[PDB]
Structure formats: C-alpha cells, structure tokens
Design a protein around this ligand. Structure first.
Ligand SMILES: Cc1cc2nc3c(=O)[nH]c(=O)nc-3n(C[C@H](O)[C@H](O)[C@H](O)COP(=O)(O)OP(=O)(O)OC[C@H]3O[C@@H](n4cnc5c(N)ncnc54)[C@H](O)[C@@H]3O)c2cc1C
Ligand SMILES: Cc1cc2nc3c(=O)[nH]c(=O)nc-3n(C[C@H](O)[C@H](O)[C@H](O)COP(=O)(O)OP(=O)(O)OC[C@H]3O[C@@H](n4cnc5c(N)ncnc54)[C@H](O)[C@@H]3O)c2cc1C
Ligand SMILES: NC(=O)c1ccc[n+]([C@@H]2O[C@H](COP(=O)([O-])OP(=O)(O)OC[C@H]3O[C@@H](n4cnc5c(N)ncnc54)[C@H](OP(=O)(O)O)[C@@H]3O)[C@@H](O)[C@H]2O)c1
Ligand SMILES: NC(=O)c1ccc[n+]([C@@H]2O[C@H](COP(=O)([O-])OP(=O)(O)OC[C@H]3O[C@@H](n4cnc5c(N)ncnc54)[C@H](OP(=O)(O)O)[C@@H]3O)[C@@H](O)[C@H]2O)c1
Ligand code: NA
Ligand code: NA
Ligand code: NA
Ligand code: NA
Ligand code: NA
Lengths: 529, 529
C-alpha cells in the first residue's frame, strides 16, 4: 500500500494537466511537489521585463477543455508572462488543484524500492512518501545555467539570472548589463532599453531574430478564432511544430530568386520565428542552400534597420540558421537608441566581473548597477541529473546517461518502472502545450490500464529504449540542428555531452509513434500483474 | 514601507514563541519561514529511535502561559521526540500560529538595504519580501555535520544522519552501524539494540554517560509539580543551567572522600547529566581536581556494569569530564547484550566506507544494511554562514566572523541593524526553553519600543560587540570546557575556528545583563529616528 497512487513533480503546464488527469479523471490519490513558491513553472520564475510567449496566444494554451477554449480571452497576439501565469492559476482554480499542489517543496530523492515495487520520494523539507506511479514534469528549460565567469560573486550590485528575476527589482534609470542574446536576452533587451539609464549587451553569438508581429488582438478576431478552434487544433496536432500555421511543402531552391525574396518578405511582415523557418519553404532546416537563402534574407533586414555600420556588423550572424527560431517586436531597432551599446565578446571577451561591473579583454570596465544572466538552461536533463534518481539494481539515472540522456518515446525510461516523464529526453520539439497534452493523455491511459488490470509494474525494455535513441539520431542527422552549437544538443555548457536530446520528427509523427505503441499492446513494454 | 513588519526564520521552540509575541501580543504583520516540512525544529528532524529530551519533562516546555502549564500533561520523566513534537504542534494550534508559518521555505538571502533601511529576504522558492525586523532562530544544533569519510557515498544500503532520520526506515532485524557517542548516538544505541539483528558502535571518543533515571511519571507527581510551577520557574530563571534542580554551592575537595562518594552516588541514583555536573559540587567544570574525582566515580560505575572487561575498557573515557553532560536509561547495560559490538576508532579507525559496510584499520569489513551518522552539528554558526546574510557596507556575516562567530548579548550583531538572533553566538548554555523565553521577550520589548517611538533602526556598536566577546572569553577561560575538544568551541569539524561561542555565566547572570542593558537605555545600542 503506497501513501499515494501517484506523485507528480512540477506545477508548470506539464504537472498541472497531469494532476488533473490522475486525480480528477482517474480518481487516484495524487500530490504535486513544486519547489517554487507558486504554480506556473516557466511563467512563475521568468518575472523579467519583456518575458512573453513566442507561440502566438491563440495556440499557447490547453485544448482539452472546449468550455475553457470558448470562455478565456487574450488581448495581445503574444502572451505576457503575467497573463500566462494568470491563465494557469485559472486552470488550477477551475479544477480545484491548489489543495493537492505542495509549493516550496523540492524533491531531492526518488528511489525505486525493488522489494515493494513502490517509489520512495524524499523532499528537502524531510518528508518521505511512497507512490506506485511517479511523473517527472521537471521542465526542458527549468534548471538555470549560471556560468562561473571569474569574479562573478564580487559584483556589488543586483546580479540575477532571468529564470530567478526577483519581483522587487526595478531597473528604471539604472545601468543594466545583460549577458546572452537568445529568446530570453533579446525580449529582455527590447523591454529593458525603455527603462534603463543605460543598457550594455554582452553578446558572444548573434542570432537570426525575425519580427514577432506582436500587437493588440482584435476582440472580433478572438471570437472568430474561438468559432474555428476544433479545426485549428486538428491542424496543430497533425503538423510538425504545432505553431498554428500551415507549414510550407515548397523547396526553397525550386522557385525563382524573386519568389524566394517575396516568400521571406511575406513571413517577415506576418511575423513569428517558427513561421520564418517552416512557413516559408519545407527545407530551411535540412537543405544547406535553403538555410543560406533564409539566413541571407535576415542579414539584409539587419543592414536595412541598424544605422551604425559597426553595430549592424556585430548584430549580423554568419553561422547556420539552425538554433531554435526566435522573434521579438523591434529588437534590431532597439540598438538605434542612444542608451544601448553592443559589446561583441568575440572581439572583447569578459575577463572578470568586478564590484562595479564587468571588465572586458580591452580593459574597459562597464559600470553597472544590475548584471542580468540571460545565459539559458541546463536543458532537458538538468533537473533529472541533479536529483538522487535511482531505478532497478539501485542505479542512478546518471549511470544510464553516460552517452547523453535517453528515454523510450520521451515519456518512459528502461530500469525505471512506473516512472513517466512530461517532456523527458528524446521527445517532440514543438509549441509546448499540445506536445504536453499528447504525453499526459497517453501516460494517463497507461496508468488507467495498470489500475483496471492490477498491473504492479510497467517499464520499457533496454532494447526498445536503444532503438528509440537510434530513431532520434537518424532523424536529427538529416537536419542542420546538430551543427548550431545550442542548448538543443547540450553544447551551451562546458563539459556537457553533445548528444541528440529531441525526437525531431514533429508532433504529427510523434503522436503516430505513441498511438502505434499503445495499439500494439504497448510494444517495447513489460506489463506485469 | 515593508511587505511585513517582521520576518522570523525557523519554527523550533525559538521561532514559534517569537511569532507568538510579534503577531499575538504586539499585533505586527509577521511571517515565519521554516525549510522543514513541519514545525518543531529539533523535534521535527530527529525522528530516530530513542530520540528524547535530556532536560526532565517538567521544565522542558514554555513557562510564559499559566493556562498551558495548568492544562498540558506529560507521562514520562523525559519527553520522547513524538511527545515534544505534539506539544509544539499544540502550541501552534492553540495560539493560532499556523496561518503565519510557511513550511518547506528556506531563506537563501537576507540583505540589509541601506537606502530603505529594510531587510530584503529571498526564499529558495523565488519569493522576495521586505521586512523592517528580521529574527533568525536558525538553531545552535540544526546544521547536520556529515564527515567526508573516504568512500561514504559508495555505501549500498541506507546511509542517514540522525538529524535526517527518514520516517519510513525500520531498522528492525537489520545489521546497523552508528558513528558517534554523544547525546544522539547513545540514546539511539539504547533504542536500536532492541530492534537491530546486530548493532556495531563506531566510537572515537567515549563520554561520561550517567543515568537519566527516566521512567513513567506518577500522575500525582505531575499534579504536585503543577501546584508548584510558580516556585519551580522562579528557581529555573535565577539558576545557571535552568534544569529545575538546586545547584551545589560546595567545593568538591572541601569535603571528605566519604562525602564525595555519597554525593556522587546520590546524583547517580537520582539521575540527569546536568544534575551530576552542577547538582553535586559547585566546581566540577572549573576545578581540574574536582573534575578528576567526578570522572573517576563514573569510570568505577562502568567497571561494575559492563561484564566483558575489554568492552568496559573501550567504554571508559580517560579525558576531561568537560563535554556537555549526557544521560541515558540503560546505556552501559546495552553493551551486555549479544547483538551489540563496540569498535574503538582510537585503536581501529575507519579507513573506508564500502558498498557492504565499513573497513577499520585492522582490515575488518563490518557488514551493514544501515549506516547511521550520529556525528552532530556545525553548531551555533552553521545556518548563519550558509545563508547569503549581508549587513551595512554589503558585508557578508562571514567577513565579521573570521576569528569565530560574534554577537552583542547573543541576540544582536554589529553591522546588522533591526536583526535579532534567538540563540545566536555568545548566548547562554542552559536548558533551552527558559533561555529562548528570556531572548524572545527582550527582543519583543525592543521591537515594541522601536514601533512606539518610530525608530527606523536599532543596532549594537562594534565596540559593544567586542566588549561582549571579551566578557564571554574571560568567563569561558575560568572553566575546563575550552580544554576539551567538542562542538561547544567548534573543535568537532576539521578547519572550523576554535573559539568561544557561548556566554557560560548561566541564565541568572545572562538575564541580569539583558535587564541592565534595557533598563540602562539600551547601553551599547545606537537607536535612530
Ligand atoms: C521565457 C520563456 C518563454 C517561453 N515561451 C514559449 C513559447 O512561447 N512557446 C513554447 O512552445 N515554449 C516556450 N517556452 C518553453 C517552456 O518551457 C514551455 O512552453 C512550458 O512552459 C514548459 O512547461 P513544463 O511544465 O514542461 O515545464 P516548466 O514550466 O519548466 O515547469 C517545471 C517545474 O518543475 C519544477 N521542478 C523541477 N525540478 C523539481 C524538483 N526536483 N522538485 C520540485 N519541483 C521541481 C520547477 O520548479 C518548474 O516549476 C518558453 C520558456 C521560457 C523560459
Ligand atoms: C535529539 C536532541 C535532543 C535535545 N534535547 C534537549 C534537551 O532535552 N534540553 C535542551 O536544553 N536542549 C536539547 N537539545 C538542544 C535543542 O536544539 C534545543 O532544545 C531546541 O530544540 C532548539 O530550538 P530552536 O528553535 O532554537 O532551534 P531548532 O529547533 O534547531 O530550530 C531551528 C529551525 O530553523 C530552521 N532553519 C535554519 N536555517 C533556515 C533557513 N535558512 N531557512 C529556513 N529555515 C531554516 C531549521 O530547519 C530548524 O527547524 C536537543 C537537541 C537534539 C538534537
Ligand atoms: N520568446 C520566448 O518565448 C522565450 C524567451 C525566453 C526563453 N525562451 C525559451 O527558452 C529557451 C532558452 O532561451 P534563453 O535565451 O534563455 O537561452 P539560450 O537560447 O541558451 O541563450 C543563452 C545565451 O547566453 C549566452 N551565454 C551562455 N553562456 C555564456 C557565457 N559563458 N558567456 C557569455 N554568454 C554566454 C549564449 O551565447 P552562446 O550561443 O555563445 O552560448 C546565448 O546568447 C529558448 O530557446 C526558448 O525555447 C522563450
Ligand atoms: N536530549 C538528548 O537526549 C539529546 C540527544 C541528541 C542530541 N542532543 C543535543 O545535540 C547535541 C549534539 O549531540 P550529538 O550526539 O548529536 O553530537 P556530538 O555531541 O557533537 O557528538 C558527535 C559524535 O560523532 C563523533 N564524530 C564526529 N565526527 C566523526 C568522524 N569524522 N569520525 C568518527 N566519529 C566522529 C564524535 O566523536 P569525536 O568527538 O571523536 O569526533 C562524537 O562521538 C548534544 O550535545 C545536545 O545538546 C541532545
Ligand atoms: Na496571477
Ligand atoms: Na516546447
Ligand atoms: Na510487478
Ligand atoms: Na566527542
Ligand atoms: Na547505564
């Protein structure tokens, strides 16, 4: 007899829906443990100015409740962090979830007991509880990456990671430095430039930023979108990246030079990063000649927008357009402001952080009241490797992951029975919520089967997991994503294994893999009862 | 304007009473942050078998409320951990405190903002709140000391510190090892011997354990004590150690051999560790001749009780009787059992922890299922030094404490305005609760003065703190305590500064110092409005 049927870790998009399925639909005893002081995951932690969705609001939400789809209003094309947090708090209120979500509670240990065949979970607060089923919704992009830049801790001002933005901090009229120009840094830079006395950007690697097209939502369009939600979610679930647009089936180099310029300009004008990469042509991420045409178009727009030719050059990337697409409102324009300076760390790397700011290699001391680390995440496997997480024969998850992190179907792990992962290693690379929905519903169905049939353990075989690794490696190596040095393949952190950590076959093909496994009596699983 | 009048850290005896004064009596807005999953401090964390008070139950409790003194019942002469925890849970219940205690919440940062003159507090859960007043009840004996014994992490069974004892762990019928024989180790050994198939004790330093005389309380005795509580508490508050017995005023060597034997035998039969040290003669802990006579009596008792002469030899300490007194029921008798073995780490030290147990320098592999670290605490300063705690000029508490931890009166710190410590460095060495009450009441009185008069800051001067260090040094250096290597002077942890960390003048003289300062216009404080 376990203390609980199920323990879920994380109260983001993943954990919130998992608890709903397990407690509300299956009638099981469940507790969520969230180490944060509120629910919302991403949208609790990322309180920094400019924090917002790069999925358009209309499809950055749950689809499973048709009444919620009819009722809930959004006012902006992309959702500000406070509005996403408000939406998730509403979902929690709507299904009476708060009473079974324990906040401020870090799970430090999860130990599979091979005698009882129960999960023994320990918290930082010194609670030990047993559960039959463990669901880890720990976040692909949850564990803060804070590089050990020499002197970092000497800084006399406010030093923060974006994923730890403190609620009291007001940068209005302060001298602000930011390190990093990914999705976090660039949206922060647009907002911060309006507030700061001076904003200094420390950029190691410029990215191919495209317009978001963000602005007010016409409430009459929101009514029409709501009219067509059934067909919109149909298209989302059958797409690769699930961003709510029809993906191009046209090869970039199959059309005229004129047509390529027109298609790119039309996506530039319409906005969205995933639209630019996948709504232009079908081979931007696979054909290197297609990739170079897309990259060239983005460089041409930078040269048009940025007035200082030195700033233009430093903003203009020359590497593969194969990092995760990013978009913003008025990013390049921000660098035309009198109070924004760009420091290329390619030219003048950081030598040392000092009480008064940042000394770069040219010996210039950038005087700062606030230093912001927009330096990203120990992505995918970060919160797994930091946990004392042990399966059969008492083996730690790290012992299994010496060649990079692994899974079966992105949701299970050989040697870890009755353990399910929401966006574990080697799952889909998409607009997040519909991928979360696919995993949570499939996991719920298998937990319901194990309940009805009296199954004591369900686990994938080592062979099924190895074949899933091979399937992900085969798909990945036909794209340019492995040659971009991003968080996606673990190349953002010194000493992290460069490895496939996603199934890159898209939501459509991912959903088919899940369905065929379930159809075939849970192919690759040993079900015991 | 702060978010809260006061933030309190810790929900042991100290934080609970401090919240009661500030919320219930002064009517301030207050929150307690406790990183533990429940209230009780010591009595939450120490879930190990045998865990119990070495203060007799009648005075191991609050005195401030006559109604609670009249009502609450205890059934054993010493309080088992579940019974002390239930008492503290009842206190939280009856005083309506739970609504203002936030569990699972570790304070990572407390930063004095010199511009606002407010404390900025950050939680591991990502809350930042401001308070005018900060009270740290972090515990003298709260931060677990776990030595880096070679191969420790390789142990294949259940390895636990006593202060992290997991609720699920049943040692019944298992091969158990324990490292340590202080108050924790010895009370655990008595309880664990009745459960374990085999209990191996890894003893580096045997101590002068005396009988507790624990057993059932006659309910007529409890009724008798409650009728006399006013005179019992008056004697406690003007005593030195506050254990509820009259302290001897007779010099051990001023009486005959026969009288020394009679007085020692009397204390031995009556029981209690502090009774033996301070209830026999006035100079056991100050006069090395008196110390020797007390030590010799205890050794003679070990020889009587322990049947195997080799075991008796290993149990018999030959160093100063100048570590904290410790008492148990049937400790030496436990070693007459067939399932208890004693390893002297003086003779055969631990060379390595291996998957199957412990290898001593005699090459013996001790085979264990469970390895218990009864290795004590980073005492007094542990939880302060681990905090990002900063005062005036942005200085970390560590920068103030390079020659050991310091305070003014054990409750304030120079450079740290509006910050108060419950059992901070250089406070009393007593039965805990009456010392906690003296400090909480003094702190409440000064916060109440500060509120009434509109004071923005209260702080001790550097000079007042330096004088308090010297006072504590003068008193400490007239005792044998500094000559014996124990947690009391920081000598239990490699690399930790050997320094005075207590005022050893006793509760009566400590209370006089607090009163003289307050009545004398807060001598040594700068009060600012
Ligand atoms: C600023 C920002 C904007 C983004 N915008 C988009 C977007 O527009 N579109 C998109 O598709 N994706 C976006 N993402 C990616 C984003 O991660 C997902 O959209 C989604 O929010 C993730 O939900 P989740 O529940 O999987 O994880 P999270 O929201 O990260 O939740 C995981 C939770 O687990 C908790 N946790 C982890 N380990 C433990 C532990 N051991 N014990 C207890 N709790 C633990 C964490 O505290 C966290 O709250 C964005 C990310 C960021 C940072
Ligand atoms: C087994 C045992 C028995 C004892 N018996 C006796 C006895 O009989 N008589 C006696 O006089 N003394 C005894 N002691 C000493 C004991 O410490 C005190 O009696 C008393 O319990 C201490 O109360 P406190 O509130 O000062 O500290 P604690 O009870 O230690 O409470 C401090 C709390 O602060 C919390 N905390 C610390 N840092 C942070 C942070 N950064 N954020 C959030 N929370 C934090 C900790 O989690 C802890 O719960 C005993 C100790 C032990 C271990
Ligand atoms: N618009 C949105 O909705 C939004 C916003 C925030 C984040 N997100 C999500 O979160 C993901 C992560 O984005 P992110 O911007 O937080 O992280 P990221 O994409 O990994 O970017 C981190 C940035 O920090 C830099 N950096 C890392 N280590 C450094 C070091 N030692 N010195 C200097 N610079 C260093 C990186 O440069 P290098 O390339 O040289 O390593 C890069 O510019 C996104 O891809 C997206 O999925 C979304
Ligand atoms: N009321 C009670 O019954 C009770 C019970 C528990 C604790 N307490 C309180 O808590 C305090 C702490 O007592 P405690 O027993 O937890 O700790 P302690 O008195 O500090 O004892 C620690 C023990 O561990 C040993 N040890 C430490 N490091 C070691 C190492 N590296 N290798 C081997 N042995 C090692 C010590 O021996 P060395 O000295 O040789 O290193 C000692 O025997 C008590 O003094 C008391 O105030 C009270
Ligand atoms: Na909200
Ligand atoms: Na996603
Ligand atoms: Na089974
Ligand atoms: Na000792
Ligand atoms: Na005894």
């Amino acid at each position: 007899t376990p203390d609980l049927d199920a323990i879920v870790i994380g109260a983001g998009f993943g954990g919130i829906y998992m608890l709903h399925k397990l407690r509300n639909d299956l009638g099981l005893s469940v507790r969520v443990f969230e180490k944060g002081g509120g629910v919302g995951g991403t949208w609790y932690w990322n309180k920094y100015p400019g924090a917002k969705s790069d999925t358009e609001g209309f499809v950055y939400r749950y689809s499973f409740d048709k009444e919620l789809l009819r009722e809930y209003d959004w006012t902006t094309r992309y959702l500000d962090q406070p509005d996403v947090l408000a939406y998730l708090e509403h979902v929690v209120e709507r299904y009476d979830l708060a009473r079974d979500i324990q906040l401020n509670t870090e799970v430090t240990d999860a130990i599979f007991d091979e005698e009882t065949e129960l999960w023994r979970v320990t918290t930082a607060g010194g609670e030990t509880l047993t559960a039959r089923f463990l669901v880890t919704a720990l976040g692909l992009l949850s564990r803060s990456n804070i590089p050990d830049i020499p002197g970092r801790d000497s800084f006399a001002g406010r030093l923060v990671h974006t994923n730890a933005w403190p609620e009291d901090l007001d940068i209005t009229g302060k001298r602000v430095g930011v390190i990093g120009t990914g999705s976090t840094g660039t949206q922060f830079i647009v907002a911060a430039a309006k507030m700061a006395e001076q904003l200094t950007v420390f950029q190691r690697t410029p990215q191919y930023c495209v317009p978001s097209g963000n602005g007010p939502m016409d409430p009459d369009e929101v009514a029409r979108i709501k009219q067509n939600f059934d067909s919109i979610w149909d298209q989302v679930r059958s797409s690769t990246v699930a961003f709510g647009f029809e993906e191009s089936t046209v090869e970039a180099m199959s059309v005229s030079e004129s047509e390529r310029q027109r298609v790119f300009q039309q996506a530039w004008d319409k906005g969205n990063g995933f639209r630019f990469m996948f709504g232009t042509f079908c081979d931007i991420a696979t054909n290197p000649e297609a990739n170079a045409a897309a990259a060239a178009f983005i460089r041409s727009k930078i040269a048009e927008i940025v007035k200082d030719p030195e700033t233009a050059r430093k903003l203009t990337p020359t590497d593969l357009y194969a990092k995760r697409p990013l978009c913003n409102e008025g990013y390049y324009e921000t660098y035309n402001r009198d109070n924004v300076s760009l420091v290329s760390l390619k030219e003048t790397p950081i030598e040392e952080i000092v009480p008064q700011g940042v000394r770069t290699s040219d010996g210039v001391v950038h005087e700062l009241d606030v230093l912001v680390f927009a330096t990203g995440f120990d992505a995918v496997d970060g919160n797994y490797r930091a946990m004392n997480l042990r399966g059969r024969d008492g083996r730690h998850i790290n012992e299994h992951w010496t060649e990079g992190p692994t899974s079966y179907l992105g949701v299970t792990k050989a040697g870890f029975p009755n353990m399910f992962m929401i966006l574990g290693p080697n799952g889909p690379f998409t607009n997040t919520p519909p991928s979360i929905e696919a995993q949570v519903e499939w996991i719920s169905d298998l937990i319901d089967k194990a309940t009805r049939e009296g199954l004591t353990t369900v686990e994938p075989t080592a062979d099924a997991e190895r074949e899933w690794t091979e399937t992900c490696a085969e798909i990945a190596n036909m794209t340019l994503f492995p040659k971009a040095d991003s968080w996606i393949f673990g190349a953002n952190i010194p000493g992290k294994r460069h490895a496939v950590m996603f199934y890159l076959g898209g939501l459509g093909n991912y959903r088919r893999q899940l369905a065929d496994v379930a159809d075939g009596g849970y192919r690759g699983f040993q079900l015991r009862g």
